[model samples]
Target chain A: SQQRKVLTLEKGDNQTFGFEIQTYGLHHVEMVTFVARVHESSPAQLAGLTPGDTIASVNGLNVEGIRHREIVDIIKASGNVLRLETLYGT
Target chain B: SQQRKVLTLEKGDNQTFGFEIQTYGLVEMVTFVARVHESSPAQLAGLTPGDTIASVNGLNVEGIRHREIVDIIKASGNVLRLETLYGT
Candidate 1:
């Protein structure tokens, strides 16, 4: 089981979110997205987003059953401030 | 696939290789390992960022799209054997 947490991140001066996402199970199973990396002292890290946290939603939109590219697009379109609802194990 | 060097990586308990792959160059594109998460299977396997990936599972990935390469890696299941080149 997992608990949900919402995070708000602002892009840095370099216009970077300072985090990366990865997707798994593209072939034989449903796609799952998770945080892959977080730069040290970056907004995502400062916002408490950690690697391995499952992404539940992006900008108030459910990300369930979406491809990795789709989620990335949403984040790219969110401008400077981005909101994310994530799931993590207790 | 090129016969330069090989890296064998086993999936972690989370079923991940613990590295990110990316495509670079404009006209003549190339795929490479972008980052290796700390203490991950990729790091344990000695994979480093900027190492160009030549193939996966013995298949030459030259000219393959970034997403396609990702799909190839994901489809390979629990274990991965990657052929790569280091340096220019």
Candidate 2:
């Protein structure tokens, strides 16, 4: 799960953020990461995100230690133009 | 979701496997019965929380991902002989 790549995208033309994300925590580990689902025809899909990508960073803010909800908040705080790092997948 | 332990037990003495599990991966994840879904299959079946799964119906589930395990559960019919790793 250490593999990653950066994806830079913008808000959709209709103001849709154009992605779905979820996170899960291990009861025995201090591990939490985001699962990204790129929307069809969205900027993320165009940038090569399809599946198996964990959102690791947002606008250079390291997301490794952040809560999943706060990470979502960061996306909004960054003004919809995102620079995200996916932990796995092309 | 490959990390696993086998659970071997009778059919609830009633008839159920009672627990909930899911899968996700990048490198991979594990398949554990996260919750006992109340009086559903797992609960009545005597499965508990934090149970690590090893196999189902003699199917070796070691190193198998979560999605496939889910498929196994879905296709395993009503009487599931879960080989899990807990106390034994």
Candidate 3:
């Protein structure tokens, strides 16, 4: 079966991770966080991350009940290296 | 939390389901059966872009290549049943 993957990406010289996060669904209903874009030849791309892959966790913390802005804050505070547990289907 | 759902769809008069499947990764690949068109049979069947297709027509798609899965769907006749995992 296809499984979740843990990807480790280091910030580039620009102090950016080179990927964007997007959310879908409703705030009171259900929301999902996914990779919206990955810059070519960036750390995220080199780590095998791709657009449309749902994010399960960031830096060992589960993001299930978190809001999109809160998740973005977590990523911002994660310093140079970020570890993301993500899932894509097979 | 993510849950698995089975979606049954019938081909439209044009003999199409109005969805697309895309793949990413290398060696160990991942596939997404999404891009469902609005008001299409696939959308009406509850298929969404976040859904990860686990099976097609009762066959588990684990270890199946993207091209092989495409072929399976192509040969699956008019009606199709897709086992999918969403919200993960």
Residue pairs that clash (backbone atoms under 3 angstroms), model 3: none
Quantify all predictions' global Cα lDDT against the true fold: 0.76, 0.61, 0.77
State fnat for each of the candidate structures: 0.00, 0.00, 0.03
Off by over 4 Å in 3: A1-90
Which predicted model would earn the best lDDT? 3
Docking verdict class for candidate 3: incorrect
What lDDT tens digits, residue by residue, belong to model 2 across residues A1-90?
Answer: 457687788774457567777655433243445344567887777776645456777889888787778887887777757788877532
Span of 10 residues, lowest total lDDT, candidate 3 chain B:
B25-34
Displacement of residue B32 (Cα, Å) in model 3 is 1.6
Question: For residues B16-66, could you state the per-residue lDDT of candidate 2 as single tens digits?
Answer: 465656443423455555556565766655665544465678876656876
In order, how many clashes per candidate?
0, 16, 0
Could you say which candidate leads in TM-score?
2
Score candidate 3 by lDDT.
0.77
Measured against the true two-chain complex, the DockQ scores of the candidates, in the order shown, are 0.05, 0.11, 0.07
Task: Between candidates 1 and 3, name the one with more favorable TM-score.
Answer: 3
List runs of model 1 lying over 4 Å from the truth: A12-14, A26-28, B1-88
lDDT of 3 at A80: 86
In the range B1-88, model 3's lDDT, one tens digit per residue, is 5477888998755568888876644334555653678888888888887566778999987677778998998888788999887633
